[PDB]
Design an enzyme around this catalytic site. Structure first.
Site, PDB file in Angstrom:
ATOM      1  N   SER A  49     -39.466  -0.194  10.594  1.00 26.13           N
ATOM      2  CA  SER A  49     -40.356   0.893  10.196  1.00 26.13           C
ATOM      3  C   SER A  49     -39.815   1.760   9.052  1.00 26.13           C
ATOM      4  O   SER A  49     -40.549   2.632   8.592  1.00 26.13           O
ATOM      5  CB  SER A  49     -40.676   1.798  11.371  1.00 26.13           C
ATOM      6  OG  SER A  49     -41.484   1.138  12.395  1.00 26.13           O
ATOM      7  N   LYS A  95     -42.105   2.096   6.011  1.00 23.07           N
ATOM      8  CA  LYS A  95     -43.241   3.016   5.895  1.00 23.07           C
ATOM      9  C   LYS A  95     -43.054   3.989   4.730  1.00 23.07           C
ATOM     10  O   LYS A  95     -44.051   4.475   4.181  1.00 23.07           O
ATOM     11  CB  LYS A  95     -43.477   3.755   7.192  1.00 23.07           C
ATOM     12  CG  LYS A  95     -43.770   2.775   8.345  1.00 23.07           C
ATOM     13  CD  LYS A  95     -44.018   3.476   9.630  1.00 23.07           C
ATOM     14  CE  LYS A  95     -44.377   2.493  10.727  1.00 23.07           C
ATOM     15  NZ  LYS A  95     -44.304   3.089  12.020  1.00 23.07           N
ATOM     16  N   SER A 155     -43.721   7.606  13.186  1.00 26.02           N
ATOM     17  CA  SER A 155     -43.660   6.141  13.121  1.00 26.02           C
ATOM     18  C   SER A 155     -44.888   5.479  13.777  1.00 26.02           C
ATOM     19  O   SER A 155     -44.776   4.455  14.442  1.00 26.02           O
ATOM     20  CB  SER A 155     -42.341   5.551  13.611  1.00 26.02           C
ATOM     21  OG  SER A 155     -42.031   4.399  12.812  1.00 26.02           O
ATOM     22  N   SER A 166     -36.835   0.561  14.147  1.00 27.42           N
ATOM     23  CA  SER A 166     -36.211  -0.219  15.207  1.00 27.42           C
ATOM     24  C   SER A 166     -37.064  -1.429  15.480  1.00 27.42           C
ATOM     25  O   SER A 166     -38.289  -1.424  15.325  1.00 27.42           O
ATOM     26  CB  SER A 166     -36.034   0.630  16.445  1.00 27.42           C
ATOM     27  OG  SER A 166     -37.205   1.370  16.717  1.00 27.42           O
TER      28      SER A 166
HETATM   29  C1  LIG Z   1     -40.794   0.569  13.408  1.00 31.90           C
HETATM   30  O1  LIG Z   1     -39.615   0.290  13.333  1.00 31.90           O
HETATM   31  C2  LIG Z   1     -41.633   0.422  14.651  1.00 31.90           C
HETATM   32  N1  LIG Z   1     -40.996  -0.484  15.557  1.00 31.90           N
HETATM   33  C3  LIG Z   1     -41.755  -1.241  16.454  1.00 31.90           C
HETATM   34  O2  LIG Z   1     -42.954  -1.175  16.498  1.00 31.90           O
HETATM   35  C4  LIG Z   1     -40.948  -2.124  17.377  1.00 31.90           C
HETATM   36  N2  LIG Z   1     -41.244  -3.377  17.534  1.00 31.90           N
HETATM   37  O3  LIG Z   1     -42.240  -3.956  16.854  1.00 31.90           O
HETATM   38  C5  LIG Z   1     -42.409  -5.366  17.228  1.00 31.90           C
HETATM   39  C6  LIG Z   1     -39.869  -1.431  18.158  1.00 31.90           C
HETATM   40  C7  LIG Z   1     -38.823  -2.198  18.674  1.00 31.90           C
HETATM   41  S1  LIG Z   1     -37.943  -1.145  19.297  1.00 31.90           S
HETATM   42  C8  LIG Z   1     -38.522   0.238  19.303  1.00 31.90           C
HETATM   43  N3  LIG Z   1     -37.958   1.426  19.804  1.00 31.90           N
HETATM   44  N4  LIG Z   1     -39.726   0.109  18.513  1.00 31.90           N
HETATM   45  C9  LIG Z   1     -41.849   1.862  15.247  1.00 31.90           C
HETATM   46  N5  LIG Z   1     -40.729   2.568  14.772  1.00 31.90           N
HETATM   47  C10 LIG Z   1     -40.014   3.554  15.487  1.00 31.90           C
HETATM   48  C11 LIG Z   1     -38.820   4.036  14.725  1.00 31.90           C
HETATM   49  O4  LIG Z   1     -37.731   3.479  14.896  1.00 31.90           O
HETATM   50  O5  LIG Z   1     -39.044   4.935  13.914  1.00 31.90           O
HETATM   51  C12 LIG Z   1     -40.100   3.526  17.131  1.00 31.90           C
HETATM   52  C13 LIG Z   1     -39.206   4.261  17.789  1.00 31.90           C
HETATM   53  C14 LIG Z   1     -41.443   3.112  17.731  1.00 31.90           C
HETATM   54  S2  LIG Z   1     -42.249   1.909  16.938  1.00 31.90           S
END
Ligand SMILES: *C(=O)[C@@H](NC(=O)/C(=N\OC)c1csc(N)n1)[C@@H]1N=C(C(=O)O)C(=C)CS1
Length: 260
Positions: free
Chosen positions: A42, A45, A102, A209
């Site tokens: 993410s 973004k 996010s 993440s």
């Molecule tokens: C961006 O990184 C996004 N991540 C996801 O949607 C995840 N998996 O997609 C298949 C994911 C795996 S682990 C986890 N905590 N989220 C969003 N980004 C955030 C961030 O790191 O800013 C998240 C905490 C929620 S979803």
């Protein structure tokens, strides 16, 4: 040395660490695997929101443009967009939700508005970033498979581009300032780079993440008495279901901002 400390951190961590710090006082850098590709997750973004800000420089109505949010737009994580199903959000509100929470639906509306992932890549290229590539929408852009080039960049390329975006030449002033406001208001970064810094430093950041325990943060840091620092910390692990590791990013931030 700082380098020995980062090596040791990585060795204990059970993964692969990528760091790039740019000290804008003298343009000096601290680099660790900074030319290696990592899945952005993410953190990508930032590029999508910035591409919309660039468009808004030449369209004074763009940021207030209404975008319809439908139940079918919801994906795996969308805490802001789900509040607006059956209604609209503006492009500005989608930028804010994408960056500060996010929100994955918000990212997808930015990408769709721009005309797809390749348009985000073209925007990066327009800023001189030859490395960034966006290939997929959310949430599949977070699969973070080792060696997969999709949705990757390098720590140094992202540090350079984040510097250009937030402190440098990429965006006109009002748009630059809007991006900085958004990053400073992030809610998702407390345990990442921010946790490795003095509590009083002002920070803007964007986390990411994904799978393979991939855990990332990109930040601009304003010390009280010194020029800004730009810091990218990327981390990824060999096993698909590895836990995410924000503590590694905090530890890296503490190592590279030490003494300073
Ligand atoms: C961006 O990184 C996004 N991540 C996801 O949607 C995840 N998996 O997609 C298949 C994911 C795996 S682990 C986890 N905590 N989220 C969003 N980004 C955030 C961030 O790191 O800013 C998240 C905490 C929620 S979803």
């Amino acid at each position: 040395s700082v380098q020995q400390q980062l090596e040791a951190l990585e060795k204990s961590s059970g993964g692969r660490l990528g760091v790039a710090l740019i000290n804008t006082a003298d343009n000096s850098q601290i680099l660790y695997r900074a030319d290696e590709r990592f899945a952005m997750c993410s953190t990508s973004k930032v590029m999508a929101a910035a591409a919309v800000l660039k468009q808004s420089e030449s369209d004074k109505h763009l940021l207030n443009q209404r975008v319809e949010i439908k139940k079918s737009d919801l994906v795996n994580y969308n805490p802001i967009a789900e509040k607006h199903v059956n209604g609209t959000m503006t492009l500005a509100e989608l930028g804010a939700a994408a960056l500060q929470y996010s929100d994955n639906t918000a990212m997808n509306k930015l990408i769709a508005h721009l005309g797809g992932p390749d348009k985000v890549t073209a925007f990066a290229r327009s800023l001189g970033d030859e490395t960034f590539r966006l290939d997929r929408t959310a949430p599949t852009l977070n699969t973070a498979i080792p060696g997969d080039p999709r949705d990757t960049t390098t720590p140094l390329a992202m540090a350079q581009t984040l510097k250009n975006l937030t402190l440098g030449k990429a965006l006109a002033e009002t748009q630059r300032a809007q991006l900085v406001t958004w990053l400073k208001g992030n809610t998702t970064g407390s345990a990442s780079i921010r946790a490795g810094l003095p509590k009083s430093w002002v920070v803007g950041d964007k986390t990411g993440s994904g799978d393979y325990g991939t855990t990332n943060d990109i930040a601009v840091i304003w010390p009280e008495n010194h020029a800004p620092l730009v810091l990218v910390t990327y981390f990824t692990q060999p096993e698909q279901k590895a836990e995410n590791r924000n503590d590694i990013l905090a530890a890296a931030a503490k190592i590279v901002t030490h003494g300073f």
